[PDB]
A paper describes a structure:
Protein arginine methyltransferases (PRMTs) are important therapeutic targets, playing a crucial role in the regulation of many cellular processes and being linked to many diseases. Then, another series of compounds (12a–12h) were designed and synthesized, introducing also an adenosine moiety and exploring the distance between the three groups. We also report crystal structures with various PRMTs supporting the observed specificity and selectivity. On the contrary, we were able to cocrystallize the compounds in the complex with both PRMT4 and PRMT6.
In fact, compound 12c exhibits a submicromolar activity (IC50 = 0.42 μM) only against PRMT4, with a selectivity for the latter ranging from 20-fold (over PRMT1) to 122-fold (over PRMT5). All six cocrystallized compounds (12a–12c and 12f–12h) adopt an overall similar conformation in the complex with PRMT4, revealing two common anchoring platforms, the methyl 4-hydroxy-2-naphthoate and the adenosine moieties, each one occupying the same binding site on PRMT4 regardless of the different linker lengths. On the other hand, the methyl 4-hydroxy-2-naphthoate moiety partially occupies the peptide substrate binding site on PRMT4 and mainly interacts with Y262, P473, F475, and Y477 on one side and F153 on the other side. Surrounded by such a “frozen” binding site, the linker of each compound adopts a unique and distinctive conformation stabilized by interactions with the protein platform in a region mapped on one side by catalytic residues M260, E258, H415, and W416 and on the other side by F153, Y154, and E267. Regarding the linker between the naphthylurea moiety and the guanidine group, a length increase from three carbon atoms (n = 1, 12a) to four or five (n = 2, 12b, and n = 3, 12c, respectively) brings additional van der Waals interaction with W416 and Y262, thus substantiating an increase in affinity and a corresponding decrease in IC50 values. If the linker is shorter (as in the case of compounds 12a–12c), the two guanidine-stabilizing hydrogen bonds established with the PRMT4 main chain are lost, and this may account for a weaker affinity compared to derivatives 12f–12h. In fact, longer compounds 12f–12h showed IC50 values in the low nM ranges compared to the μM range observed for shorter compounds 12a–12c.
Residue numbers in the entry:
A (entry chain C), D (entry chain A): 136 to 478
B (entry chain D): 136 to 477
C (entry chain B): 135 to 477
The structure:
């Protein structure tokens, strides 16, 4: 019911329909960075799992629970709300781990868990880290976490950096200018050009890019999953002050994220940065409505305010200005309707 | 409401949310074969519109209503349930047609019209013709049609033919082969092999192909929109008997459709066949989990059974057998989870 | 009871020696200029190892190797052959006026009796993967006639193995077995035999040549020193391996080839069947994995190839390979007596 | 048993190992002429199977038994001596036909059947019809056949015809002349040229061919499987008198066969003639050691004598003369070492 109160029915239906497909599980499993890093984090921190209780929030096919089993976990509660729970049950049975892994179909906010656990494992990251709003289910699950327990991942760092991409910015108007013709099959479409521009600029661009478009060291906003409450994610204000390393027109902000698995033996990092091999998270770019010229040495400052909505996503408000000149820009984007541009 | 009772709210939300985007409207309008053919059908049959009352079911941005206006329609009621209705109204005003195009926001099953109409126009065809279940709304609108009124399009021909395409079969078979792995990172996935194959082959393959892959002349199934009732599209049974022209493996059936605008001046055809230029409908192929072998001269008999679901799509059942040998193939597909391949 | 018959199902020996009794088979072996030319170079260029020496030719066939020893100046060559090709060898010895130097002795080297101990043994005991046909044991068995200072031509044999990637080959075999998926072949459901078919097809070693760019790591080498090895050594051959992957991608199996060296007194002459060398009538051999292993460049692929000699003059092979980083293991059986000739 | 007395233990081992491979069953099942005609013959004569007792001699995977079940047979005893019998049992179970099909592992000469049968079905044809000597097992099975029972196939027609193929003839001496060189790597091989020629000419050529190489209407030799006895096939004398339709050199005799399923409703034919689509029986050509010139209208008379051997094959003796000139030729061939020439 915590989940229910913060989610529209129609959004939850699709959301779990999407993750009920084995083709989707397979896509996530075939991401070697994602899968290998989760395995290393768990196996290389075996003392955090050996003979321990484990909670797996949104286990999907259950791959992370088998890794926890490989590390010697005594008992693992694997919670999954989609129909994938049935397939996870099959793998538990076929891998002779019914005594160690128990699949619980349902949402972690609603299911009954019998005991407190020593550690919670999960993959609740979406685009820009926060999209899909499952980090709140991850943090909600800490009601079953012993005091002094641990979280895998333990922290999440979202990175923001200004970028220049003249061709991406102009692409928006080339597409919108379809409407700027007085006789499309005899019809004057011009009146809708402004609405088309507005529509395109509300879409965060999901794809990857050359790191040479980034004009400044990124700014990092950290969520400590051991300390955070799920309420901390309803409104996420990310201040930024970029020390411009390059001179040129800034067309928007680029987003990626890292997560760290802070175990007793070592810390393992999973990065979706553009300096690292591409993942199924890709990167995310939000354009300013107008570009801001910035010289190397200038400071570009502002805030990125993420306001959670009931569509399991966020409304993104970005305000930015070049301090040395006062030039200002902004944009308001809907993270639930991104434009998949990757080629 | 008829629409609400046959549709899960969840599906309707996304459905109308999808067609409320100007980018989607642009994508459909830039299909020149579609837009140019609809304009030809309408303008070439201008006498079917001159001083006539028109209903445009699901008008989107209103392009079809403007065509009706260009052809001389006295008054056009343009119904649209998505938020695109407000954009259409903007275009009506900016094109100075307020006296002839009247946008009516809402579902055609729910709104009220002040008068009966002489002709209904619409673009209700989806993948495989029937996907998205909008033909039922199109036929539902006939409650507003005068006796002996016309419909544009007037009929719809679904074509189906067996094909051979080893690449396609192996491509989908290979994906499903991921779940045979006995030790993926030390995990036995083999238990879920059967479920993966089932899922992958339930997906209709949406794309185009060279006509050379077809192993027999197509079988036609015709829906006459002037006669069909919307209840007719709840359960669609298409029997087929193919006379094989080439020997080899039949990996499935290929689907496409044509619609005809039977006007008073001339009949105009809109075809999505693989012999014709590509459209945003492409073609659709249903794969058999196991290919059937046949020799030239054999007959391939069976039935394609389409049952409409509450998600605005169809549950597909394809039974096919080679009569000469008794080799049978039973297949089930989920038109709501296609594989966009092109 | 002779050593040969004790270890050989009589049904296999009759077929085996009938195969080599045909003159067409001798022609095919002799027309391999790499084989025949290299054997002659190893003998003639180490002539002092033969001049006025006693020679044993094990499995002489038509006798070509005995004639090479005679060209090098051997005092006496005992040419042992168990097939009916022995009679043809006698004809060539007479027609080449070498009756005073080449003495054909029909029978099996395990069963015949020689008049004297010999200085050097010559033979072509190599089959596919070096070990197929189990003739190396007859070669090693013949050392009962070898003088203390004796020598063996070949002297050593190097088995090479390396992981390869070859999607076409894997699909080709996987497609053949797909025949047994059919639920209604002429109205008959064959699907219950699908697993048995794939097992059968993937037990077949692929006798083929290939481009070296399919290999994903440097080859591992297993050496057999024919001077030191005992006949019993080849009943169980254990080959461990630890490959350092040079390329990322799917590992579809292991490729095998072999080199032998004629370590003479004047020089060592090498006969190589490697894919980097001209093709021979041994080709190369690949053992496919029913399920390919994914590995990344820099990962380690480790395991063991174990050959257990059977009564059909061949080996039952088990290949267990695992990607160390992830625990992805592949276990495979191969019947070296049912090869798939792909060439 | 009768089988063990007429078969060398060694030949049998290899024989049943060959048919124990699913890949071999698959190849026979994929011959659409073979599989499709057997199905048509059985199904279109359903009254010969409806509520009838059936014996399937050498059922392999069991497909012919399944056709007999499709035709409504009450009880089918499917006898198979290879290890394929275990796979046939798996298919009977998975096809829910255990109530009507009983797989009996073993040789039809040695197993015991619980009752007599109404009809025997089998695929006993080899190359030249008689190769592999399976027809004797087929006839031997008639000890279980009721009086006035039927056989499927019922009869077999072997067709002989003289052919001209200069290039096939000359191909034999091109291959054998490899031995006709005085210094192959310093060795004089010429003494074995005659033996190499002999060996090549003793090989029946398994191949297909354009029907235009035939020079006279074929001659037919018929075995009636309802009347013939096992011993009738130990010595098969086929006289022939060809009336040459074309002038030229005759290089040998071509062989093919038809079988007829004489059912109650109709007769169905399975033909392997060179005018019909190719089957896995191909055709067989036996060369004359010396060709014979014949004018159109001349008469080529002679005999083909087939003598069974314990290698499950036949020694072939062919003598032929042109009556108008007395020109004569012979040849002795061994049907167990055919030359597979098709490509
Ligand atoms: C409008 O349309 C669009 O344009 C659009 C909109 C979108 O949002 C899109 C999103 C996509 N997705 C994606 O980016 N995929 C790649 C990144 C890897 C993500 C890996 N992590 C993850 N999020 N999995 C969580 C697991 O936990 C389970 N779970 C969740 N809650 C619970 C709970 N309360 N109790 C138990 N289980 C729970 C879940 O069911 C699931 O199994 C793709 C396409 C999209 C397109
Ligand atoms: C696997 O991934 C998925 O999950 C997935 C699965 C799928 O099946 C997908 C299928 C897609 N399909 C497509 O490509 N579509 C565009 C091309 C054909 C355009 C043909 N034109 C047409 N039928 N337009 C309807 C108009 O009529 C209006 N309307 C309708 N009813 C009413 C009513 N009762 N009252 C008033 N108005 C109404 C509507 O709002 C709208 O304006 C795309 C994406 C898909 C993604
Ligand atoms: C389709 O799949 C199959 O069914 C299949 C399966 C197979 O394994 C197949 C194998 C093939 N063979 C081949 O070419 N492989 C490559 C080797 C190149 C040639 C290397 N030469 C050699 N092996 N030397 C033996 C000589 O030494 C004599 N000998 C032996 N022991 C003794 C003894 N105790 N005393 C005296 N003499 C002895 C012998 O009689 C002979 O003269 C072909 C086809 C095959 C097909
Ligand atoms: C030596 O190297 C060569 O040069 C060579 C020599 C050859 O002769 C070769 C021949 C080949 N073969 C082929 O392509 N033939 C074409 C037609 C195949 C149609 C099937 N014909 C058939 N005879 N199958 C009988 C079935 O009945 C089973 N069976 C048999 N007896 C009994 C019994 N007493 N009780 C129960 N079951 C029994 C058996 O196991 C089997 O299942 C290929 C390669 C060859 C190569």
């Amino acid at each position: 019911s915590v989940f229910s109160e913060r989610t529209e029915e129609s959004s939850a239906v699709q959301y779990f329909q999407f993750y009920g497909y084995l083709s989707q599980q397979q896509n996530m499993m075939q991401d070697y960075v994602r899968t290998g890093t989760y395995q290393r984090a768990i196996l290389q921190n075996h003392t955090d799992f050996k003979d321990k209780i484990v909670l797996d929030v949104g286990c999907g096919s259950g791959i992370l629970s088998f890794f926890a089993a490989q590390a010697g976990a005594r008992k693992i509660y694997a919670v999954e709300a989609s129909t994938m729970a049935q397939h996870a049950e099959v793998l538990v049975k076929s891998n002779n781990l019914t005594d160690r892994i128990v699949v619980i179909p349902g949402k972690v906010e609603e299911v009954s868990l019998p005991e407190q656990v020593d550690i919670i494992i999960s993959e609740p990251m979406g685009y820009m880290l926060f999209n899909e709003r499952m980090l709140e289910s991850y943090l909600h699950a800490k009601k079953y976490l012993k005091p002094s327990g641990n979280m895998f991942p333990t922290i999440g760092d979202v990175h923001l950096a200004p970028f220049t991409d003249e061709q991406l910015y102009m692409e928006q108007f080339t597409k919108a200018n379809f409407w700027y013709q007085p006789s499309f099959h005899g019809v004057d479409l011009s009146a809708l050009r402004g609405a088309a521009v507005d529509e395109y600029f509300r879409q965060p661009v999901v794809d990857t890019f050359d790191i040479r478009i980034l004009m400044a060291k990124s700014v990092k906003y950290t969520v400590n999953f051991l300390e955070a409450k799920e309420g901390d994610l309803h409104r996420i204000e990310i201040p930024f002050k970029f020390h411009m390393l390059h001179s040129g027109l800034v067309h928007g902000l680029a987003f990626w994220f890292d997560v760290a698995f802070i175990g007793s033996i070592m810390t393992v990092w999973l990065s979706t940065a553009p300096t690292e091999p591409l993942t199924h998270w890709y990167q995310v770019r939000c354009l300013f409505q107008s570009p801001l010229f910035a010289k190397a040495g200038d400071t570009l400052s502002g805030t990125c305010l993420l306001i959670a909505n009931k569509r399991q996503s966020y409304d993104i408000s970005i305000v930015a200005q070049v301090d040395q000149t006062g030039s200002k820009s902004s944009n308001l984007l809907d993270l639930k309707n991104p434009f998949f541009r990757y080629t």
